[PDB]
Design a protein around this nucleic acid. Structure first.
Ligand SMILES: [Mg+2]
Ligand SMILES: [Mg+2]
Ligand SMILES: [Mg+2]
Ligand SMILES: [Mg+2]
Ligand SMILES: [Mg+2]
Ligand SMILES: [Mg+2]
Ligand SMILES: [Mg+2]
Ligand SMILES: [Mg+2]
Ligand SMILES: [Mg+2]
Ligand SMILES: [Mg+2]
Ligand SMILES: [Mg+2]
Ligand SMILES: [Mg+2]
Ligand SMILES: [Mg+2]
Ligand SMILES: [Mg+2]
Lengths: 199, 134, 107, 190, 176
RNA sequence: ACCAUCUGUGGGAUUAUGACUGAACGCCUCUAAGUCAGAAUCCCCCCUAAACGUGACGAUAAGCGCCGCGGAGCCUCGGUCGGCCUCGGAUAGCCGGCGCGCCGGCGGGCAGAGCCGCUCGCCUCGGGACCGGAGCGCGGACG
RNA sequence: GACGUCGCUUUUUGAUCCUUCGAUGUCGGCUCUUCCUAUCAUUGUGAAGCAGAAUUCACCAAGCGUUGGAUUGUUCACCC
RNA sequence: UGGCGCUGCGGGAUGAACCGAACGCCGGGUUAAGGCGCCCGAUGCCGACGCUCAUCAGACCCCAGAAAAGGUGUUGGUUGAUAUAGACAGCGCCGAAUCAACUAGCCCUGAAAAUGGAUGGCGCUGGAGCGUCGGGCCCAUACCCGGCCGUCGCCGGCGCUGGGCUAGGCCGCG
RNA sequence: GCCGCGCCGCCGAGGCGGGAGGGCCCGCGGGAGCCGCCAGGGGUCCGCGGCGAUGUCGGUGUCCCACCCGACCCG
RNA sequence: CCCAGGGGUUCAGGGGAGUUACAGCCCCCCCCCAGGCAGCAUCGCCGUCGCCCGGGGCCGAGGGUCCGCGGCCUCCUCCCC
């Protein structure tokens, strides 16, 4: 019911153009690891694009002007909002279906995350072109939580790898059981191989 | 790091296009994008074809440069391309994928019943070895 | 379940005009125009719940109401379809579920 | 215009044992080991032959900007070869007119304290890169010796010392004082 | 001309209207490359009108037929001598192409003259096209394929079908 | 009341620029790939404010809080129409198994193009199984 | 940088008369905030007909500062 | 000469004049100009070929900022000149091509103004950029077919009656 | 270039007359006649189902509210 | 089936060891346009709605014959009962 997407390796606008279309169709999308989102062009380009964004403020009262969020999740959230009619009740309901997170929080750490091939860097960008990470771009504009997120993501990959190694033993046990009971499932494996289920 | 190359005689699999699913022999390379393929034993006559719809296979037949279809057919039959392809896992996964798409409602019920008992028998064997190992 | 999942993506519109007498549905599995032919003519239903109870055919009254429609033609190249309902779909249904029935069947 | 194939072969001596893990080249010689990743060049590397090993750097369908990175791969590995067999010996020379440049090496060649440059009281503490050892040269008055296996680390450690002795607000054509690189050689001379 | 789609080699033969003062005017044949014959006739009355004192009204076209490829199954090197008007002036050029059909190479030329020089179809005048052997080719991009036992892989194959699975758990591979 | 007195601050990426390695272009080259130093600028810390943002915790009045899937009912608001309980990532290579090797698999069948769940009930064959499964159940690890 | 020549700016003036004549208070000063850079000074550099000192040219650059007075209503000048 | 004024409609974000097309009230269909990453209907095509990296990239009538002059950025083309009686570059060695001028695309320099801001916005760099094209698709009060209303035109029809002919009525057609 | 003849080429551009047969055709020979059928002067069924007075059915355009789209103040 | 029977020539994206050899390519001749099968089926264009069949959507406005057929008007035979 919830489209959990991993933000690592994806482009900013390529992914936001698709996530904005899913929430308008009444679907709930959760984009994790927004610091891993890539942006085409060298880093100095995208950094200047954000520094020029920092200058856009109401001269008389900056507290009313454009709120410049520094977190990579809120940066990607503002990108998706730009492709939505957020000044209408239909567009505001679409924003309520999207939840962005820096890293992979516990509510989604134990989940299988989707990948959008139409937004990956390997598919949409040349191998020789320059790109930039949203985690470094945010760190150099005021994101104060890059070091704590990197350490928490570091421990998240340790417990995710211990689970994967246990999952590899279960697959080894499952493949071994298929050979030790092949005589009892011979009539069943012939049905699946007959209808193309197995090969 | 590369093992499959585009060369004279390289048997290629057409993923999409008008001849999707058939094997062709790259007899000549026109440009960086297109080639001159010809499948005499498959049903794809000599014609230009882009590389984006080709998928290189592990079969290379010995055909001369710009030889007509009579000699491209000999190397296709000398190397037994159709026999080696039909026994390769590439075609067997294609055959399995085609049969799964032609399954009727009664075929899915027979698969539902077969897979239901096949998993429960394997799942208990996994529990049997776990109890034995401890 | 005997119906296909569809989403009320919006009305038949241009950019500055909206024709509410025609709806654009998005079927969950149809992502190409060459796949919309199967659904041409299928019954559409916008099932929802209200406050007051209404009569139910073949059952007891409840809060469930429905607006029946039918897929008329395809729309674009991405598997979208057009549907006309006896009453124009309310704007609150945009992004909600539309049941695409398997009848009238042609298989 | 895109060239079909652009290759170049690198000769590898018998005392160097090279291992390829994708694009990460690892050379091991009598003077130590080196390891430099080339995953940003996007080329093909291959070791041909068991005896008299070679390194084949291939580039398929590359324009002029991408063909230029082919020899850069080869010239880098050749530096990694002579860095583990012969090494690199960059020699500095302290040039001064009136005030002699006092260089004292500390932390076992990992720190260079430059004193009495143009009579300045400020002390210039230049820390060498990892694996680079600096030493006051013998048989010479104001010569330094920078040794290491990686040319990019020894030549960079020489640029740190040289740019540290920079004259400000003066005619540099008249005030030619500083520690400059005089010779770029090897530790073993064959 | 718009050069829509793949052009066709038309052999348009025409002449002037026979007059009592000068009867039996000579027949003039041209090698027109137009997407259809209606454009091939209009293109004929563009070069003949500027080379000779002939007009569409005072002349007639006796034959406008499509020229088929005599060797469609063979890869041939073509040489196209053409003049085109830039934003500054007119320049003569000689291009080379590898294709199966003469019309498929002239079509490939319009796609190239407009790509590298921003030259539109109305500014290009194809003057001479002839099949050239591999020993008389000048361009390295064409002459690099003149090598038997040619071999090259397909490095970093871009994943097409990006939207057939739009959301998948497996990241695509580019090495095959 | 500088008309008395006290205090006023740390880093990060980098600009200009100077360089390293090194091609293109047998040489050369700060640049093409890759690196270094680098500033009254920029960002941030320090500092002021504290959001239709919020955490921990205390105390919680014949009333009131927990605990009997309370045990039955009356008004209301929305969806929705099987789950997936998870490596890290590479993309000019990857994955699996076995003590830097070897073996095996790659248009991904150890496959998200997938996996898993899925006879209308209630009793009877014993033909295959030892599926010993099922808890408004009682305890113990793991957050 | 002569003879030439190509631009830019809207802090001069002119040209125009589109908005306002059932009215947009109009010069300067004072006060006060913010902005621009076509940088005078300070920060980091490059160049010299840069020995030092002083100065000139150019670059990144508007963070910071650009004062006190005589005369004049004057902006503008001039002088201490 | 057309148009605006006297005129709405689709498109150009926007806007008296531009592009398309002019208007009774509706249904179905099809288009124009213009579009089809998301806002925003449509390419969620396994589109084709190239060009281009921009530390002020670029992004299409009117139209809403550029020039002269430059670049050993990159890609084309043109006209010449040296070279296996051994050139170019580097120290006779080296052993295969090389050099010069000119021209044309894109990018770059030239390129400085004042509240914070404008390919419309988000954003886009195996393209959502520029050029050349293909197939498909999107909708205007335009076009086609159908209903209804009114007007106008019929050398209109009916005084020859179940209904009918208040003929100032009724009916038919375009 | 015209005119005449001859030869030759012309799916069958073809037309006339006749001959051996084979077999494909005709709004020729069938209409002041009875019966039906119907791609024939604009739709019918000589088809059918569910629901039924205290909580339901239809309307409630013009009472309130919600959302999408359009939409700047008249003279 | 190099179609076979006589052969000639020719280069190179040069196979085998420079011109067919342990692959082939091209240009030409005299023998039944050798036969045999396909016919815009890698590449166009167009029909005397061109012949037939099917599917989806939209709606029935009006309300006192024409044009195609078939059976019988002629006797039987067969199938089906
Ligand atoms: Mg630099
Ligand atoms: Mg640095
Ligand atoms: Mg002058
Ligand atoms: Mg400036
Ligand atoms: Mg000085
Ligand atoms: Mg004063
Ligand atoms: Mg007027
Ligand atoms: Mg008028
Ligand atoms: Mg505009
Ligand atoms: Mg319409
Ligand atoms: Mg648009
Ligand atoms: Mg200049
Ligand atoms: Mg520019
Ligand atoms: Mg009509």
């Amino acid at each position: 019911q919830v489209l959990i997407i991993d933000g690592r390796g994806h482009l900013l606008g390529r992914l936001a153009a698709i996530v904005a279309k899913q929430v308008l169709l009444g679907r709930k999308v959760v984009v994790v690891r927004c610091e891993g989102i890539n942006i085409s062009g060298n880093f100095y380009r995208n950094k200047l694009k954000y520094l020029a964004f920092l200058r856009k403020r109401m001269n008389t009262n900056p507290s009313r002007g454009p709120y410049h969020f520094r977190a990579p999740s809120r940066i990607f959230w503002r990108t998706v909002r730009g492709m939505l009619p957020h000044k209408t009740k239909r567009g505001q309901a679409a924003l309520e279906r999207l939840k962005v997170f820096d890293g992979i929080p516990p509510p989604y750490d134990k989940r299988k995350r989707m990948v959008v091939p139409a937004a990956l860097k390997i598919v949409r960008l040349k191998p020789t072109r320059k790109f930039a990470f949203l985690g470094r771009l945010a760190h150099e504009v005021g994101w104060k939580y890059q070091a704590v997120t990197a350490t928490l993501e570091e421990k998240r990959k340790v417990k995710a790898k211990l689970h994967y190694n246990k999952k590899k033993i279960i697959v080894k046990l499952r493949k071994q059981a298929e050979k030790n009971v092949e005589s009892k499932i011979s009539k069943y494996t012939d049905v699946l191989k007959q209808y193309g289920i197995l090969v | 790091v590369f093992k499959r190359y585009v060369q004279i005689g390289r048997v290629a699999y057409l993923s999409f296009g008008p001849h999707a699913g058939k094997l062709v022999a790259i007899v000549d390379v026109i440009d960086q994008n297109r080639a001159l393929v010809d499948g005499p034993c498959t049903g794809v006559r000599r014609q230009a074809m882009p590389f984006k719809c080709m998928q290189l296979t592990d079969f290379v037949i010995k055909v001369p440069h710009s030889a007509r279809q009579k000699y491209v057919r000999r190397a296709w039959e000398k190397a037994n391309v159709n026999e080696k392809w039909a026994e390769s896992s590439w075609a067997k996964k294609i055959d399995a994928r085609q049969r799964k798409a032609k399954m009727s409602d009664f075929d899915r019920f027979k698969v539902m019943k077969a897979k239901k008992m096949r998993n429960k028998i394997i799942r208990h064997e996994m529990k049997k070895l776990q109890k034995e190992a401890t | 379940r005997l119906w296909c999942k569809a989403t009320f993506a919006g009305y038949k519109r241009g950019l500055r005009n909206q024709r509410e007498h025609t709806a654009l549905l998005k079927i969950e599995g149809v992502y190409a125009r060459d796949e919309t032919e199967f659904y041409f003519g299928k019954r559409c239903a916008y099932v929802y719940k209200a406050k007051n109870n209404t009569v139910t055919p073949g059952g007891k009254p409840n809060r469930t109401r429905v607006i029946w429609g039918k897929v008329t033609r395809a729309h674009g190249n991405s598997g979208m379809v057009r549907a006309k309902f006896r009453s124009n779909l309310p704007a609150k249904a945009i992004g909600h579920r539309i049941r695409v029935m398997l009848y009238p069947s042609r298989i | 215009m895109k060239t079909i194939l652009s290759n170049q072969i690198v000769d590898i001596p018998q005392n160097v044992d090279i291992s390829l893990k994708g694009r990460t080249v690892t050379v091991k010689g009598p003077r130590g080991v080196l390891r430099k990743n080339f995953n940003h060049i996007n080329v093909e590397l291959c070791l041909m032959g068991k005896k008299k090993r070679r390194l084949r750097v291939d580039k398929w369908w590359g324009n002029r900007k991408e063909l230029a990175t082919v020899r850069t791969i080869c010239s880098h590995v050749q530096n990694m070869v002579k860095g583990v067999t012969l090494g690199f010996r960059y020699k500095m020379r302290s040039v001064y007119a009136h005030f002699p440049i006092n260089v004292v090496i500390q932390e076992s060649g990992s720190l260079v304290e430059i004193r009495n440059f143009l009579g300045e009281k400020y002390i210039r503490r230049v820390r060498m890169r990892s694996g680079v050892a600096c030493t006051v040269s013998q048989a010479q008055k104001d010569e330094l010796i920078l040794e290491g296996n990686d040319i990019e680390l020894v030549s960079n450690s020489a640029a740190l010392i040289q740019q540290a002795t920079t004259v400000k607000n003066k005619d540099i054509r008249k005030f030619l004082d500083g520690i400059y690189v005089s010779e770029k050689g090897t530790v073993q001379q064959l | 001309m718009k050069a829509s789609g793949t052009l066709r080699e038309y052999k348009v033969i025409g002449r002037s209207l026979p007059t009592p003062k000068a009867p039996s005017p000579p027949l003039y044949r041209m090698r027109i490359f137009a997407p259809n014959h209606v454009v091939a006739k209009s293109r004929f009355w563009y070069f003949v009108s500027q080379l000779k004192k002939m007009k569409k009204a005072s002349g007639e076209i006796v034959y406008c037929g499509q020229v088929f490829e005599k060797t469609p199954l063979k890869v041939k090197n073509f040489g196209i001598w053409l003049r085109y008007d830039s934003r500054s002036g007119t320049h003569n050029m000689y291009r080379e192409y590898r294709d199966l059909t003469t019309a498929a190479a002239v079509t490939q030329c319009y796609r190239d003259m407009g790509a590298r020089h921003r030259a539109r179809a109305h500014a290009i005048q194809i003057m001479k096209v002839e099949v050239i052997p591999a020993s008389k080719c000048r361009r390295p991009a064409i002459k690099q394929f003149h090598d038997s036992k040619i071999k090259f892989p397909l490095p970093h194959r871009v994943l097409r079908r990006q939207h057939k699975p739009r959301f998948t758990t497996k990241r695509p591979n580019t090495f095959f």
